[PDB]
Design an enzyme around this catalytic site. Structure first.
Site, PDB file in Angstrom:
ATOM      1  N   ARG A  11      -2.264  12.396  -1.146  1.00  0.00           N
ATOM      2  CA  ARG A  11      -1.298  11.438  -0.655  1.00  0.00           C
ATOM      3  C   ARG A  11      -1.461  10.063  -1.294  1.00  0.00           C
ATOM      4  NH1 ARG A  11      -3.260  11.628   4.463  1.00  0.00           N
ATOM      5  NH2 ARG A  11      -3.089  13.743   5.395  1.00  0.00           N
ATOM      6  N   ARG A  34      -3.124   3.997  -8.969  1.00  0.00           N
ATOM      7  CA  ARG A  34      -2.099   3.219  -9.683  1.00  0.00           C
ATOM      8  C   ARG A  34      -2.684   2.622 -10.922  1.00  0.00           C
ATOM      9  NH1 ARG A  34       0.117   0.128  -4.825  1.00  0.00           N
ATOM     10  NH2 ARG A  34       1.124   1.809  -3.663  1.00  0.00           N
ATOM     11  N   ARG A  62      -9.571  13.433  16.499  1.00  0.00           N
ATOM     12  CA  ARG A  62     -10.511  12.334  16.412  1.00  0.00           C
ATOM     13  C   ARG A  62      -9.972  11.230  17.297  1.00  0.00           C
ATOM     14  NH1 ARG A  62     -15.208  13.341  14.238  1.00  0.00           N
ATOM     15  NH2 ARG A  62     -15.431  11.236  13.350  1.00  0.00           N
ATOM     16  N   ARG A 111     -13.416   0.175   9.700  1.00  0.00           N
ATOM     17  CA  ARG A 111     -12.815  -1.048   9.288  1.00  0.00           C
ATOM     18  C   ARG A 111     -12.822  -2.117  10.368  1.00  0.00           C
ATOM     19  NH1 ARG A 111      -6.359   1.116   8.866  1.00  0.00           N
ATOM     20  NH2 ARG A 111      -6.247   1.013  11.182  1.00  0.00           N
ATOM     21  N   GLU A 155     -13.539  -0.957  14.361  1.00  0.00           N
ATOM     22  CA  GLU A 155     -12.996   0.389  14.665  1.00  0.00           C
ATOM     23  C   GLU A 155     -13.986   1.519  14.299  1.00  0.00           C
ATOM     24  OE1 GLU A 155      -8.420  -1.403  13.959  1.00  0.00           O
ATOM     25  OE2 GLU A 155      -8.831   0.561  13.145  1.00  0.00           O
ATOM     26  N   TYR A 164       0.436  14.344  13.406  1.00  0.00           N
ATOM     27  CA  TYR A 164       0.431  12.913  13.177  1.00  0.00           C
ATOM     28  C   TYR A 164       1.845  12.586  12.675  1.00  0.00           C
ATOM     29  CZ  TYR A 164      -0.463   8.121  11.768  1.00  0.00           C
ATOM     30  OH  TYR A 164      -0.467   6.731  11.702  1.00  0.00           O
ATOM     31  N   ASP A 222       4.481   9.191  11.671  1.00  0.00           N
ATOM     32  CA  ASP A 222       4.773   7.782  11.493  1.00  0.00           C
ATOM     33  C   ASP A 222       5.925   7.407  12.423  1.00  0.00           C
ATOM     34  OD1 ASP A 222       2.871   7.474   9.354  1.00  0.00           O
ATOM     35  OD2 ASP A 222       4.399   8.193   7.937  1.00  0.00           O
TER      36      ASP A 222
HETATM   37  C1  LIG Z   1      -4.353   5.024  15.288  1.00  0.00           C
HETATM   38  C2  LIG Z   1      -2.904   5.181  14.903  1.00  0.00           C
HETATM   39  C3  LIG Z   1      -2.347   4.265  13.981  1.00  0.00           C
HETATM   40  C4  LIG Z   1      -1.009   4.423  13.626  1.00  0.00           C
HETATM   41  N1  LIG Z   1      -0.427   3.539  12.729  1.00  0.00           N
HETATM   42  C5  LIG Z   1       0.889   3.708  12.342  1.00  0.00           C
HETATM   43  C6  LIG Z   1       1.489   2.886  11.381  1.00  0.00           C
HETATM   44  O1  LIG Z   1       0.910   1.947  10.829  1.00  0.00           O
HETATM   45  N2  LIG Z   1       2.819   3.079  11.060  1.00  0.00           N
HETATM   46  C7  LIG Z   1       3.541   4.097  11.644  1.00  0.00           C
HETATM   47  O2  LIG Z   1       4.696   4.248  11.300  1.00  0.00           O
HETATM   48  N3  LIG Z   1       2.974   4.947  12.583  1.00  0.00           N
HETATM   49  C8  LIG Z   1       1.652   4.750  12.935  1.00  0.00           C
HETATM   50  N4  LIG Z   1       1.093   5.589  13.858  1.00  0.00           N
HETATM   51  C9  LIG Z   1       1.934   6.670  14.464  1.00  0.00           C
HETATM   52  C10 LIG Z   1       2.743   6.126  15.691  1.00  0.00           C
HETATM   53  O3  LIG Z   1       1.896   5.632  16.691  1.00  0.00           O
HETATM   54  C11 LIG Z   1       3.648   7.206  16.301  1.00  0.00           C
HETATM   55  O4  LIG Z   1       4.653   7.503  15.369  1.00  0.00           O
HETATM   56  C12 LIG Z   1       4.355   6.911  17.600  1.00  0.00           C
HETATM   57  O5  LIG Z   1       3.414   6.417  18.544  1.00  0.00           O
HETATM   58  C13 LIG Z   1       4.822   8.296  18.121  1.00  0.00           C
HETATM   59  O6  LIG Z   1       5.513   8.127  19.339  1.00  0.00           O
HETATM   60  P1  LIG Z   1       5.625   9.199  20.541  1.00  0.00           P
HETATM   61  O7  LIG Z   1       6.604   8.519  21.497  1.00  0.00           O
HETATM   62  O8  LIG Z   1       6.110  10.469  19.973  1.00  0.00           O
HETATM   63  O9  LIG Z   1       4.188   9.383  21.202  1.00  0.00           O
HETATM   64  P2  LIG Z   1       3.408   8.291  22.057  1.00  0.00           P
HETATM   65  O10 LIG Z   1       3.562   6.870  21.587  1.00  0.00           O
HETATM   66  O11 LIG Z   1       2.007   8.809  22.150  1.00  0.00           O
HETATM   67  O12 LIG Z   1       4.093   8.258  23.522  1.00  0.00           O
HETATM   68  C14 LIG Z   1       3.930   9.286  24.457  1.00  0.00           C
HETATM   69  C15 LIG Z   1       3.895   8.686  25.867  1.00  0.00           C
HETATM   70  O13 LIG Z   1       3.810   9.778  26.771  1.00  0.00           O
HETATM   71  C16 LIG Z   1       3.075   9.340  27.908  1.00  0.00           C
HETATM   72  N5  LIG Z   1       2.631  10.518  28.639  1.00  0.00           N
HETATM   73  C17 LIG Z   1       1.864  11.506  28.098  1.00  0.00           C
HETATM   74  N6  LIG Z   1       1.646  12.456  29.035  1.00  0.00           N
HETATM   75  C18 LIG Z   1       2.288  12.076  30.160  1.00  0.00           C
HETATM   76  C19 LIG Z   1       2.380  12.683  31.401  1.00  0.00           C
HETATM   77  N7  LIG Z   1       1.691  13.814  31.583  1.00  0.00           N
HETATM   78  N8  LIG Z   1       3.113  12.068  32.414  1.00  0.00           N
HETATM   79  C20 LIG Z   1       3.716  10.841  32.191  1.00  0.00           C
HETATM   80  N9  LIG Z   1       3.600  10.241  30.947  1.00  0.00           N
HETATM   81  C21 LIG Z   1       2.925  10.857  29.938  1.00  0.00           C
HETATM   82  C22 LIG Z   1       1.962   8.537  27.307  1.00  0.00           C
HETATM   83  O14 LIG Z   1       1.423   7.638  28.222  1.00  0.00           O
HETATM   84  C23 LIG Z   1       2.687   7.815  26.166  1.00  0.00           C
HETATM   85  O15 LIG Z   1       3.083   6.531  26.603  1.00  0.00           O
HETATM   86  C24 LIG Z   1      -0.233   5.447  14.203  1.00  0.00           C
HETATM   87  C25 LIG Z   1      -0.788   6.345  15.114  1.00  0.00           C
HETATM   88  C26 LIG Z   1      -2.137   6.223  15.454  1.00  0.00           C
HETATM   89  C27 LIG Z   1      -2.715   7.213  16.453  1.00  0.00           C
HETATM   90  O1  LIG Z   2     -10.852   3.230   1.936  1.00  0.00           O
HETATM   91  C1  LIG Z   2     -10.442   4.403   2.079  1.00  0.00           C
HETATM   92  C2  LIG Z   2      -9.134   4.660   2.537  1.00  0.00           C
HETATM   93  C3  LIG Z   2      -8.707   5.989   2.739  1.00  0.00           C
HETATM   94  N1  LIG Z   2      -9.572   7.016   2.501  1.00  0.00           N
HETATM   95  C4  LIG Z   2      -9.206   8.419   2.673  1.00  0.00           C
HETATM   96  O2  LIG Z   2      -7.795   8.574   2.641  1.00  0.00           O
HETATM   97  C5  LIG Z   2      -7.305   9.057   3.906  1.00  0.00           C
HETATM   98  C6  LIG Z   2      -5.901   8.507   4.155  1.00  0.00           C
HETATM   99  O3  LIG Z   2      -6.120   7.244   4.749  1.00  0.00           O
HETATM  100  P1  LIG Z   2      -5.058   6.160   5.081  1.00  0.00           P
HETATM  101  O4  LIG Z   2      -5.844   5.044   5.768  1.00  0.00           O
HETATM  102  O5  LIG Z   2      -4.419   5.708   3.846  1.00  0.00           O
HETATM  103  O6  LIG Z   2      -3.956   6.926   5.953  1.00  0.00           O
HETATM  104  P2  LIG Z   2      -3.953   7.154   7.581  1.00  0.00           P
HETATM  105  O7  LIG Z   2      -4.870   8.344   7.862  1.00  0.00           O
HETATM  106  O8  LIG Z   2      -4.326   5.841   8.283  1.00  0.00           O
HETATM  107  O9  LIG Z   2      -2.424   7.614   7.771  1.00  0.00           O
HETATM  108  C7  LIG Z   2      -1.976   8.370   6.609  1.00  0.00           C
HETATM  109  O10 LIG Z   2      -2.040   9.769   6.926  1.00  0.00           O
HETATM  110  C8  LIG Z   2      -1.156  10.152   7.984  1.00  0.00           C
HETATM  111  C9  LIG Z   2      -1.301  11.666   8.199  1.00  0.00           C
HETATM  112  O11 LIG Z   2      -2.426  11.870   9.079  1.00  0.00           O
HETATM  113  C10 LIG Z   2       0.289   9.720   7.686  1.00  0.00           C
HETATM  114  O12 LIG Z   2       0.862  10.568   6.697  1.00  0.00           O
HETATM  115  C11 LIG Z   2       0.451   8.275   7.177  1.00  0.00           C
HETATM  116  O13 LIG Z   2       1.834   8.096   6.797  1.00  0.00           O
HETATM  117  C12 LIG Z   2      -0.593   7.944   6.071  1.00  0.00           C
HETATM  118  O14 LIG Z   2      -0.653   6.561   5.665  1.00  0.00           O
HETATM  119  C13 LIG Z   2      -8.388   8.678   4.894  1.00  0.00           C
HETATM  120  O15 LIG Z   2      -8.469   9.565   6.032  1.00  0.00           O
HETATM  121  C14 LIG Z   2      -9.638   8.862   4.048  1.00  0.00           C
HETATM  122  O16 LIG Z   2     -10.073  10.258   4.063  1.00  0.00           O
HETATM  123  C15 LIG Z   2     -10.875   6.707   2.050  1.00  0.00           C
HETATM  124  O17 LIG Z   2     -11.676   7.642   1.858  1.00  0.00           O
HETATM  125  N2  LIG Z   2     -11.275   5.425   1.834  1.00  0.00           N
END
Ligand SMILES: Cc1cc2nc3c(=O)[nH]c(=O)nc-3n(C[C@H](O)[C@H](O)[C@H](O)COP(=O)(O)OP(=O)(O)OC[C@H]3O[C@@H](n4cnc5c(N)ncnc54)[C@H](O)[C@@H]3O)c2cc1C
Ligand SMILES: O=c1ccn([C@@H]2O[C@H](COP(=O)(O)OP(=O)(O)O[C@H]3O[C@H](CO)[C@H](O)[C@H](O)[C@H]3O)[C@@H](O)[C@H]2O)c(=O)[nH]1
Ligand SMILES: Cc1cc2nc3c(=O)[nH]c(=O)nc-3n(C[C@H](O)[C@H](O)[C@H](O)COP(=O)(O)OP(=O)(O)OC[C@H]3O[C@@H](n4cnc5c(N)ncnc54)[C@H](O)[C@@H]3O)c2cc1C
Ligand SMILES: O=c1ccn([C@@H]2O[C@H](COP(=O)(O)OP(=O)(O)O[C@H]3O[C@H](CO)[C@H](O)[C@H](O)[C@H]3O)[C@@H](O)[C@H]2O)c(=O)[nH]1
Lengths: 383, 378
Positions: free
Chosen positions: A173, A177, A249, A279, A300, A348, A350
């Site tokens: 992924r 560059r 995780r 990080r 984190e 996972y 976005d």
């Molecule tokens: C660590 C992390 C970093 C991320 N960073 C990015 C990023 O930089 N850019 C990006 O585009 N995406 C990012 N994402 C992905 C992004 O968070 C998701 O796309 C988005 O949250 C998905 O939305 P969802 O509504 O499907 O799930 P969720 O946001 O998880 O919402 C589900 C909701 O359901 C509720 N719920 C669950 N079970 C019950 C129940 N039994 N009864 C009542 N309520 C319930 C929960 O409380 C929650 O509020 C990241 C994700 C993670 C985990």
């Molecule tokens: O300094 C670094 C940065 C990244 N990685 C490796 O590259 C992977 C990808 O890492 P990113 O931080 O770039 O990506 P995220 O896991 O935070 O999220 C990424 O992976 C997701 C799928 O789990 C989504 O596709 C999302 O759009 C994409 O940016 C990491 O798990 C890691 O194994 C390293 O080893 N060192």
């Protein structure tokens, strides 16, 4: 007919599906077990510093989907923001993702793009026909030195496994560059909402046909009061975890405050396995159009998700997929329910992907009412 | 009553003033001695590579002025773009302007912002350009990034120059490497020449190229707006205002020659000041062939295009004499980088031109005389 709709979760998945159906005259009931909307996208301000904190992780909006991009622009003011990650390793600070500056700094050179290609090609091992593992992909394309500096220790920390035991796809992924572009993302549209994702989702939730009850768990007895249920909570949790828990995780966010600029950028990766956090994030830099003297930071730490931890990254190895298959076979036997989202489908996703899938899923339910057919359990391929 | 307006120069200053007045019913004659519109903002496609080339050097649009942003968005589609300059010196490549990455990489450290403040304070003197540098950033940084480039750019040792300029480039103790701190920043999708072509597209505007201003023409017009050099207008009777000029040596690379729009070379032993690779100003386009320029700085002699006004004691005393005769003019307003002897960004040029037309229009309705300058310069 005005159908009665239960939606479990007020994150993007719930909010978007519920908004599409409200607009077509259906009565949407949206519940969330948390005391706030937003799901994993929730952000909120810290008292002391007034910094907007992305509570469940940096959430950088990025998409090539102009439809999705226009949608969120109806519900927020999207500010330009370009994610530029730094990395600390070997007593030095580097630019990520790997680019011409990183290469010239790491190997102490002044290579042009074409000279850097030749340099990395020499370090790479083109005798590996089709890298299966994360390690092989690194050894094939970036070479041992870069692999062990920037990837090996970080990847062990993040995943709890040796890279020889992880799929090549994870690294497939990432941009190697050969120019000086250090934008972390390739997508055409990129930014952050001026008033945060909570406010954005609040706007999506702001409709006459939507009632939102918070601090309210789904109860399996409820389904019979509704014509259809959209469920974005965990698939395994829906079935009482009866076959075991889908592996994830999780992350611990260790909060601290600094009076000033603690690191001088939003995201600093610590690539050494010997630094225990993955990080450090400095949240005010996600809102560069604002000024704040105080600063909320996070260290984190990645760990296996246990019973009471929030699930963040799905592991999705054969074991977890075997477990997933058993929950699928119960799901396929349901009527009048649809499992959606990161938790409902064990993927996972976005923000922009979640939004697009929620638009599709509403569309499918609308079309199936017009076609007097049955709404499927999943609107996306998950097997 | 519609006035006959003569405007000398078809760059931003003339084009914008002329559109504002054309829209209000005035008859506008714009002329330019060059064979193209646009002035120093002019761009055009190289034949061989199809790369949009910034003919008179890089022009990056940046502004905190939302009226001005909105105004050019009416005449172009602004594409996002962030200028990120790299610098080669001492066998390494760095980001400019000096920032926390530059400092960490230069000294081999992992400083935080405050740790780096303490590191630079130590290295500063406490014990002019060469004065401000040694006091504020220390010998090593000054000699690596500033001393060589300054000599090449200005043709003078830094020991001979004012604290300002450097005062205008503070060390940034964060990882932000955007060259410009302005709210709005971008490049026009189809280039500045089209953008100025649209500003000029109005029924009341006549444009003539390859046309020299001749003082005998003045009496045919109710007013003249002059954006050519102030000293030339007066026959250089007191001497020529000092400028640096630039030579560009064009070459073509099949590929990506350097991998960024602008690479500076800070060493005095490198003869060019920088290399620009023009396709990087249009990252939304793809081009296999690349047009590049090695860029060289010299004293601006009589046959050269004037780029950077020197604006040190002698030039400012010289300017003052031309100001004091411009001030006794009637029916003329001097504008622009060349008319007022100032380096002006595109946004500032557009903001001043809009204000200049506004003052003129207000001078007609109030029956008042139009001043000779609409900004201060003396
Ligand atoms: C660590 C992390 C970093 C991320 N960073 C990015 C990023 O930089 N850019 C990006 O585009 N995406 C990012 N994402 C992905 C992004 O968070 C998701 O796309 C988005 O949250 C998905 O939305 P969802 O509504 O499907 O799930 P969720 O946001 O998880 O919402 C589900 C909701 O359901 C509720 N719920 C669950 N079970 C019950 C129940 N039994 N009864 C009542 N309520 C319930 C929960 O409380 C929650 O509020 C990241 C994700 C993670 C985990
Ligand atoms: O300094 C670094 C940065 C990244 N990685 C490796 O590259 C992977 C990808 O890492 P990113 O931080 O770039 O990506 P995220 O896991 O935070 O999220 C990424 O992976 C997701 C799928 O789990 C989504 O596709 C999302 O759009 C994409 O940016 C990491 O798990 C890691 O194994 C390293 O080893 N060192
Ligand atoms: C090297 C350099 C880099 C720059 N980079 C940037 C940048 O990145 N971003 C930015 O915002 N700005 C930049 N600028 C500034 C930018 O070029 C100016 O803002 C712009 O040129 C101002 O427009 P103008 O119409 O006032 O002057 P000009 O563009 O110089 O136009 C004057 C016009 O008048 C004509 N003329 C002169 N005398 C006569 C005469 N005797 N008879 C007939 N016609 C005459 C000239 O031919 C010329 O076409 C840069 C400038 C320089 C020199
Ligand atoms: O690698 C470098 C770069 C710059 N400088 C010094 O810093 C000064 C500033 O040069 P810049 O390249 O940063 O900017 P320009 O001279 O091309 O133009 C700048 O100064 C202008 C006034 O002349 C405008 O205000 C404009 O907006 C701003 O970018 C130079 O004269 C030079 O003496 C160095 O020593 N080394």
């Amino acid at each position: 007919k005005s159908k009665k709709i239960l939606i479990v979760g007020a994150g993007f998945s719930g909010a978007v599906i519920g908004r599409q159906l409200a607009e077509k005259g259906h009565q949407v009931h949206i519940i969330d077990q948390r005391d706030h909307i937003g799901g994993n996208s929730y952000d909120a301000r810290d008292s002391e510093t007034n910094v907007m904190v992305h509570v469940y992780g940096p959430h950088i909006f990025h998409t090539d989907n102009e439809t999705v991009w226009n949608y969120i622009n109806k519900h927020a003011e999207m500010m330009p923001y370009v994610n530029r990650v730094k990395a600390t390793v070997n007593g030095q600070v580097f630019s990520l993702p790997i680019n011409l500056h990183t290469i010239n700094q790491f190997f102490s050179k002044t290579c042009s793009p074409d000279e850097a290609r030749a340099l990395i090609a020499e370090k790479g091992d083109s005798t590996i026909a089709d890298p299966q593992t994360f390690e092989e992909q690194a050894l094939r394309f970036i070479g041992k030195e870069l692999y062990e500096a920037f990837f090996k220790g970080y990847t062990i920390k993040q995943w709890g496994m040796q890279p020889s035991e992880l799929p090549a796809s994870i690294l497939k992924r990432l941009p190697v560059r050969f120019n000086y572009d250090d934008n972390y993302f390739n997508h055409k549209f990129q930014g952050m909402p001026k008033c945060g994702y909570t406010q954005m989702i609040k706007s999506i939730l702001n409709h006459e046909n939507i009632k939102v009850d918070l601090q309210r768990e789904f109860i399996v007895d409820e389904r019979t009061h509704y014509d259809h249920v959209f469920y974005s909570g965990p698939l395994d949790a829906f079935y009482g975890y009866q076959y075991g828990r889908l592996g994830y995780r999780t992350l611990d966010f260790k909060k601290f405050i600094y009076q000033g600029d603690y690191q001088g950028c939003a995201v600093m990766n610590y690539c050494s396995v010997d630094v225990p956090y993955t990080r450090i994030t400095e949240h005010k830099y996600f809102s560069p159009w604002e000024q704040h003297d105080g600063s909320v930071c996070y260290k984190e730490y990645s760990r296996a998700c246990e019973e009471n931890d929030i699930p963040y990254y799905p592991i999705r190895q054969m074991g977890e997929m075997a477990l997933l298959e058993k929950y699928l076979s119960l799901a396929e036997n349901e009527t009048n329910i649809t499992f959606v989202g990161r938790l409902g489908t064990y993927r996972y996703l976005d923000m922009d992907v979640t939004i697009a899938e929620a638009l599709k899923t509403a569309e499918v339910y609308l079309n199936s009412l017009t076609d007097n057919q049955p709404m499927p359990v999943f609107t996306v391929s998950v097997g």
